[PDB]
Amino acid sequence: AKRRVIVPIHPTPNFPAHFIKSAFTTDPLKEKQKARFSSGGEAMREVQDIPKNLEGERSRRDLASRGDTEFQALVEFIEGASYDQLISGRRFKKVYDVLSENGHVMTPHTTLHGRRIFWIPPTWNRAGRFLGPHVTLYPGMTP
Amino acid sequence: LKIAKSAFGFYLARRGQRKYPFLRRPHIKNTHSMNPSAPYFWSFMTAKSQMAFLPEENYITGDWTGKFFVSKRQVYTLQHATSGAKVRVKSFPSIFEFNSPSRWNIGKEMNTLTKPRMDLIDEQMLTKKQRLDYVRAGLLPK
Amino acid sequence: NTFLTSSVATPPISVIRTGPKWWADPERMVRQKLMYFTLGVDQLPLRRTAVIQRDLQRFHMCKPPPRVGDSTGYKRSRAAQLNTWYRRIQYQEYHMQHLFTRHVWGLLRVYPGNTTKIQGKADDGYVGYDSVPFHRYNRAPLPFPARELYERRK
Amino acid sequence: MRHIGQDVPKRHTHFVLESRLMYEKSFRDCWLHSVCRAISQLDEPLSKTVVGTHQKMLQRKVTCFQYNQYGLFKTPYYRLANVDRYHAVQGVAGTREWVPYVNVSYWTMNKMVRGGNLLVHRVHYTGWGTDSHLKKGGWEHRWNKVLQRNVLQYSRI
Amino acid sequence: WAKPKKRPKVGQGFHEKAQKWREEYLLDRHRALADSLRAYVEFSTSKRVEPWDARFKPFDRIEKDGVYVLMRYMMEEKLQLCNYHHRPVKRLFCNIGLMGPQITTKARWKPYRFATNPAGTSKAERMYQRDKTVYTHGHND
Amino acid sequence: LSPLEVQRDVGRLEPIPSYAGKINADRSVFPFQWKTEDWYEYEVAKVRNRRFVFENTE
Amino acid sequence: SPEFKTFTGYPMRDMRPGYGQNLPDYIMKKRLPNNTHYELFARRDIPNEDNAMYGKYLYD
Amino acid sequence: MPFDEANLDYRDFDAHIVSEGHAMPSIANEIAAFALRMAVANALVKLIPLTRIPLKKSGLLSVDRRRERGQFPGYLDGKKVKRRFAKR
RNA sequence: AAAUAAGAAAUUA
């Protein structure tokens, strides 16, 4: 069948074990599938919803020093109107959760082209002609 | 390329029918070099001035053993006719000889005396498919 | 007339569909008007045309008025009727232009483009110096030199 | 040789080296060649001092000398082959398959730009660019402006 | 990109055939050349139809007035020497100066291929009745 | 009233600008109107002279 | 002419139809290839770029 | 038009327009004229401030952003026309 | 081949 063969990569000073099992696969029927997602310290705490169990002096220090989270959320969402930030739908979502706690022929192919908040910005390996979200091709004259 | 007529058949791509900038096509194939004109006889595919000297190639430049064919930009001179010596030129399949000397050749380059694309076709250098395609164009009888 | 060669005729409606680009290009329309005015004849059809087209141009970037659905189809048919009216108002003009131009050329001792009628002078299409040696539509042989429609003095 | 112990993956890369030597030969022969051409073809008198039979004679003497120079490099540049220093891919210069300032073929330009190796900047594929001059008159105009700052801004002496 | 198939070998005795065919193609070309030179010169030497288009002015005018007067009395000899070939005719008209700026601007001339007809030409068909065996580029009768 | 002295705000009364009827009209001054020959010559001269500068001056 | 967008102020080309690299006149005013970009290509663009800076054996 | 919209007499004003874009031997064409009209209107507004309100409503000061498509060698004409297609 | 500084207007899943 002329079955393709792939030789294992062993851990390397720049290429640690988890990087290898997550970014590299020796079975080439599993190539070109799709992207996998994982979570780190904070996004993990959000997704996993670990209720904090009460603890020693630090935990009660932070039960007494907490203040209004109903308010703090609100503030942080507002703060997106600051000159150096944008207004986030995520920040808003967090506020909401705390309050409620109780052309057309081509826009398959234009899918990147509006003003788009990104997560991962596209890169030149994966995107041939896209210029970036900030770009204005047909600028008007403004004083 | 589809068929390899030379080594380069292996190295080169055709790229369909692709356009090159004016008067630069990678390979100089002068199909037109013998293209009869009475009034333009002395200006067409010849020297732009009649006061130019004959090219390098009409002269023996160094100590030679001998040559097989002379170059095709060599110009036919009265001595080519008169001397009765071998005058060969590299054409395809092999070589064209000027055997039957005439003064009507004189003063033109052998480019112009050698028909590059002959009306004659070998059926034995053609695949059965290619022969079919030459019958479609109304060249080969069948 | 400088443009003498055989030509391709386009159906009137496609000529009119060019709108501002040709049929209603201001520049062209004005010298039509000049021809009529000089002959001492009102240019009414030209003015109708200019009115229709002027307005076409003014609203040309707007979206059409919102359509409510009707079993009658009275709306659709009234829009259509108006439209073909305008089309005909302009056919009449297009005809006038070809008409008067040919007539005026007859007065100016002008030779038309190949295969063209000039009512009093060349009944079958006039031709001289075509790429093809016969008259195209008669299938009759052309004389050398080019046939003359007018007596000699100038 | 004969494909024994070859160091480079593509053998034809060597041709690129050969090409370099061609340009070298041209530097060695250009001045000479062109002088012999100009003195040969000159119909007007050469000068006050060299005229008439002397000039005719000297002309023929020179073109005889020029024909005698074996290996003198007369080939016009546009007839030399352009071949990549990397993958030995070839392209016709003045065509979209050859990229002039890096002097690599389209194939290599693509490979090198997409995996980042060349540092370039992406610009909308359909226009003239970021550049003012190209934006004005396109390729010919920018070509001209380059002539202008290489030559014309000098009043030579 | 498929590996290029190998080209079949040349032929047996095709080297002789190619030699002979080119040989006598050249021998033929000598007479084709001789004949077309004869034709070219015969054309240069012989008369042509009048180059100007009479449908426009100043040429339409009755042959007894205007430009035709200017031609009959001042230019006739020269116009006949050059055999009404359209190039020298147009130049002579420029140099007679009594027309002056008009030659290129107001006056119209026949198109190239019509102006090249032999004097006496009656029907247009003549353009197509000239000899095709001869390589003059339409400069032959 | 010259168009600048006219009071165009329905709700205010503004001080009339000091140039209102004052600046006079000479075609020699403005609007700019000029011969084509001179314009050509000017433009070309201005390009050719970019580098004629004495930098070091007393 | 300042009327065309392409206006450099200098006569970029001379408008002579026949003019060619052939002519003695052209040869007399012409930039020789020595020390132009052609030389730069001749030296710096070669198959293994490091062989431009030093003998491999030496370095090794 | 801008002198009209502002209810002004054009004869009370001197204007000179300067071409800062691509020069051409003839700017007579409707697009160039659109740009002209706009320049004049913006000047008029800097000069007679209140005149801005009629002008802005009649859409004189408004700038349309349109361009010929960038040149591009893929298309036959260099702009809009894709090359010939044949089924295999 | 085209609804893109051009100018086109009414029969969705």
Amino acid found at C111: Y
CB of H63 closer than 8 Å to CB of A141: yes
CB of A141 closer than 8 Å to CB of H20: no
Residue C101 is encoded by which pair of tokens?
Answer: 């131009």
**Burial annotation E19-46 (CB, 10 A radius, 16+ → b, else e):** bebbeebbeebeebbebbbebbeebeee
CA dihedral over H39, H41, H42, H48, signed as positive or negative? positive
CB of B113 closer than 8 Å to CB of B105: yes
Q: How far apart are CA D92 and CA G46, in angstroms?
A: 18
Decide if A141 and H63 are in contact by the 8 Å CB cutoff: yes
For chain C, the 3-state helix, strand and coil shares in percent, each to the nearest 5, are 45, 5, 45
CB of D68 closer than 8 Å to CB of B58: no
Q: Which of E8, E5, E134, E139 is nearest to E85 (CA)?
A: E139
Q: How far apart are CA G13 and CA G19, in angstroms?
A: 11
CA-to-CA separations, H52 to C32, D72, F1, H45, in angstroms, rounded? 40, 76, 20, 5
Residue A12 is encoded by which pair of tokens?
Answer: 């390397």
Please give the helix or strand (H or E) that residue A31 lies within, else none.
Answer: none
Q: Which chain H residues touch D124 with a CB distance below 8 Å? A: 70
Beta bridge partners of B75: B109
Q: Residue C6's Cα: distance from chain center in Å?
A: 17
Residue C76 per-residue DSSP state: H
Q: How far apart are CA A74 and CA A98, in angstroms?
A: 9
> Which nt is closest to the CA of A137, judged by C1'?
I4
Q: How far apart are CA H27 and CA G3, in angstroms?
A: 10
Q: How far apart are CA C87 and CA C83, in angstroms?
A: 6
CB of E45 closer than 8 Å to CB of E140: no
Neighbours of chain G (3+ CB pairs under 8 A): D, F, H
Amino acid found at D40: S
Q: How far is the CA of C66 from the C1' of I13 (A)?
A: 22
Residue of A nearest to H68 (CA): A138
Q: How far apart are CA B61 and CA C97, in angstroms?
A: 77
Q: How far apart are CA A121 and CA A123, in angstroms?
A: 7
Residue of B nearest to D94 (CA): B21
Beta bridge partners of C141: C134
Q: How far apart are CA A42 and CA E84, in angstroms?
A: 99
Q: How far apart are CA B114 and CA B98, in angstroms?
A: 9
Residue D83 is encoded by which pair of tokens?
Answer: 């071949």
Q: Which chain D residues touch A129 with a CB distance below 8 Å? A: 124-125
CB of D59 closer than 8 Å to CB of D67: no
- C17 contact to strand I (CB, 7 A limit): yes
Show me where chain B is broken: residue before each gap, C-N > 2.5 A. none
Neighbours of chain A (3+ CB pairs under 8 A): D, H
CA-to-CA separations, E101 to C79, E10, E94, E96, E106, in angstroms, rounded? 58, 66, 8, 11, 8
Q: How far apart are CA C64 and CA C83, in angstroms?
A: 14
Residue E55 per-residue DSSP state: T
Phi-psi region of B16 (alpha: psi -120 to 50; beta: other; left: phi over 0): left
CB of C16 closer than 8 Å to CB of C90: yes
Q: How far apart are CA F19 and CA B55, in angstroms?
A: 81
Q: Which chain B residues touch E27 with a CB distance below 8 Å? A: 100, 102
CA-to-CA separations, A108 to A105, D76, D106, in angstroms, rounded? 8, 50, 29
CA dihedral over C68, C70, C74, C76, signed as positive or negative? positive
What values do phi and psi take at C73, rounded to 5? Answer: 75, 25
Q: How far apart are CA D38 and CA G26, in angstroms?
A: 9
* Radius of gyration of the CA atoms of chain H, in A: 20
CB of H22 closer than 8 Å to CB of D136: yes
Q: CB count, 10 Å around CB of E15?
A: 13
Q: How far is the CA of A137 from the C1' of I6 (A)?
A: 18
Touch criterion met for A and H (3+ Cβ pairs within 8 Å)? yes
CA-to-CA separations, F20 to A57, B10, D31, E84, F8, in angstroms, rounded? 79, 84, 72, 76, 14
Q: Which of H13, H9, H48 is nearest to F5 (CA)?
A: H48
Q: How far apart are CA E133 and CA E137, in angstroms?
A: 11
Q: How far is the CA of H68 from the C1' of I4 (A)?
A: 8
Q: How far apart are CA C43 and CA D15, in angstroms?
A: 78
Resolution of this deposited model, Å = 3.1
Phi-psi region of D52 (alpha: psi -120 to 50; beta: other; left: phi over 0): left
Q: Which chain D residues touch H69 with a CB distance below 8 Å? A: 126
Beta bridge partners of E65: none
Best of H14, H46, H47 to disrupt the F interface by mutation (most F CBs within 10 Å)? H14
Q: How far apart are CA A81 and CA A72, in angstroms?
A: 15
> Which nt is closest to the CA of C21, judged by C1'?
I7
- H84 contact to strand I (CB, 7 A limit): yes
Q: How far apart are CA D82 and CA D94, in angstroms?
A: 11
Residues 6+ apart with CB under 8 A from B83: none
Q: How far apart are CA B111 and CA B72, in angstroms?
A: 5
3-state class of C54 per DSSP?
A: helix
Beta bridge partners of B96: B89
Q: Residue F11's Cα: distance from chain center in Å?
A: 33
Nucleotides of I under 7 A from a protein CB: 1-11
Compute the C-alpha angle D58/D60/D65, nearest 5°: 95
> Which nt is closest to the CA of C79, judged by C1'?
I10
Regarding beta strands B3-4 and E5-6, do their DSSP bridges make them parallel or antiparallel, or are they unpaired?
parallel
Residue B31 is encoded by which pair of tokens?
Answer: 């199909």
Q: Does B61 lie at the interface with E, CB-CB under 8 angstroms?
A: no
Q: Does F25 lie at the interface with H, CB-CB under 8 angstroms?
A: yes
Q: How far apart are CA C135 and CA C115, in angstroms?
A: 8
CA atoms within 13 A on the CB side of D111: 9
Q: Which of C20, C13, C25, C18 is nearest to C83 (CA)?
A: C13
CA-to-CA separations, D156 to D153, F23, F49, in angstroms, rounded? 9, 50, 14
CB of A125 closer than 8 Å to CB of D115: yes
Q: How far apart are CA C113 and CA H60, in angstroms?
A: 45
CA atoms within 13 A on the CB side of F29: 5
3-state class of B81 per DSSP?
A: helix
Q: CB count, 10 Å around CB of C4?
A: 21
Q: Which of H15, H48, H54, H2 is nearest to F6 (CA)?
A: H48
In angstroms, the separation between the Cα of residue D154 and the nearest Cα of chain B is: 32
Q: CB count, 10 Å around CB of C127?
A: 27
Residue A96 is encoded by which pair of tokens?
Answer: 């909401």
Q: How far apart are CA E111 and CA E90, in angstroms?
A: 13
Q: Which of B27, B33, B47 is nearest to B115 (CA)?
A: B33
Name the residue facing E19 among B13, B96, B113 (closest C-beta).
B96
Q: How far apart are CA C18 and CA C24, in angstroms?
A: 8
CA-to-CA separations, A34 to A23, A30, D8, H39, H55, in angstroms, rounded? 12, 9, 37, 54, 56
CB of H19 closer than 8 Å to CB of G4: no
Residue C21 per-residue DSSP state: G
Q: CB count, 10 Å around CB of D63?
A: 19
Q: How far apart are CA F5 and CA E47, in angstroms?
A: 84
Q: Which of B23, B28, B26, B29 is nearest to B15 (CA)?
A: B26
Residue A11 is encoded by which pair of tokens?
Answer: 């851990």
Decide if G3 and H25 are in contact by the 8 Å CB cutoff: yes
Span between the terminal Cα atoms of chain H, in Å: 57
Q: How far apart are CA E77 and CA E74, in angstroms?
A: 8
The coordinates were experimentally obtained by cryo-EM
Q: Does B3 lie at the interface with E, CB-CB under 8 angstroms?
A: yes
Alpha helices in E46-73 (DSSP H): 67-70
Q: How far apart are CA D86 and CA D91, in angstroms?
A: 13
Beta bridge partners of B89: B70, B96
Touch criterion met for A and G (3+ Cβ pairs within 8 Å)? no
Surface-to-core class of residue C112, CB atoms within 10 Å of its CB (0-12 exposed, 13-18 middle, 19+ buried): buried
- C7 contact to strand I (CB, 7 A limit): no
In angstroms, the separation between the Cα of residue F32 and the nearest Cα of chain H is: 6
Residue A30 per-residue DSSP state: S
Contact map slice: C 77-116 vs E, CB within 8 A: 109, 111
Residue of G nearest to F50 (CA): G9
Residues 6+ apart with CB under 8 A from F24: none
CB of C102 closer than 8 Å to CB of C118: yes
Q: How far apart are CA E141 and CA E44, in angstroms?
A: 9
What values do phi and psi take at D78, rounded to 5? Answer: -75, -10
Q: Does G32 lie at the interface with D, CB-CB under 8 angstroms?
A: yes
Residue A91 is encoded by which pair of tokens?
Answer: 């920040």
CB of E14 closer than 8 Å to CB of E72: no
- H33 contact to strand I (CB, 7 A limit): no
Q: CB count, 10 Å around CB of C95?
A: 12
3-state class of G13 per DSSP?
A: coil
> Which nt is closest to the CA of H82, judged by C1'?
I1
- H37 contact to strand I (CB, 7 A limit): no
- C60 contact to strand I (CB, 7 A limit): yes
